[PDB]
Amino acid sequence: MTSTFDRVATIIAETCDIPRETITPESHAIDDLGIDSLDFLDIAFAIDKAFGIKLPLEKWTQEVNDGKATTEQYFVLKNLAARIDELVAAKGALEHHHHHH
């Protein structure tokens, strides 16, 4: 059950004003959804804001550039939701005290 993706696809539907139904977990941001890097910046900011995590989008690009990881691992919605879910479990250890809303 891609419940993290339920949350993320709601966020994209708020940002781009595209219905959540057009956003499937298999969708590649810079292909299927036609989301630019400049558009995905604000989506990534709204995810960062929502879950109380940080998406290191800059370093994720560097992962692809150095061959540490694939571009699809950060720009496909099932795999991005997985990365977010990893960072939610991670931040549970060392999150700074911001009133969760």
Question: Please, could you describe this protein's structure?
Answer:
α1 crosses α2 and α1 crosses α5 (77-94). With 101 residues, the protein is mostly helical. The protein contains five helices and no strands. It has one domain (1-101).
Number of domains: 1
Q: Termini separation (Å)?
A: 24 Å
Overall 3D shape: globular
Elements, N to C (H/E) = HHHHH
Q: What is the CA-based Rg, rounded?
A: 13 Å
Which secondary-structure class do the elements indicate?
mainly alpha
Number of strands: 0
PDB class: transferase
Keywords: Structural Genomics, Northeast Structural Genomics Consortium, nesg
Assembly: monomeric
Entry title: Solution NMR of the specialized apo-acyl carrier protein (RPA2022) from Rhodopseudomonas palustris, refined without RDCs. Northeast Structural Genomics Consortium Target RpR324
Keywords for this entry:
101 residues; 5 helices; 0% strand; Ppantetheine_attach_site; lipid biosynthesis
Short description:
One of its GO terms (biological process) is lipid A biosynthetic process. The protein is mainly α and 101 residues long.
Which SSEs are present, and which pair or pack?
Layout: H1 3-15, H2 37-51, H3 57-66, H4 72-75, H5 77-94
Helix pairs in contact: 1-2, 1-5
PDB class: transferase
Keywords: Acp-XL, transferase, Northeast Structural Genomics Consortium, nesg
Assembly: monomeric
